[PDB]
Ligand binder design. Structure first.
Ligand SMILES: CC(C)=CCC/C(C)=C/COP(=O)(O)OP(=O)(O)O
Ligand code: NA
Ligand SMILES: [Zn+2]
Length: 12
């Protein structure tokens, strides 16, 4: 969603 943290979420 826009937090830019690698390792959690879709992959951004
Ligand atoms: C207790 C939990 C599950 C906390 C999750 C917080 C977090 C760093 C999410 C990543 O968001 P992101 O914007 O990097 O996600 P995406 O890769 O989908 O964009
Ligand atoms: Na992420
Ligand atoms: Zn995100």
């Amino acid at each position: 969603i826009c937090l830019x943290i690698k390792x959690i979420x879709h992959x951004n």
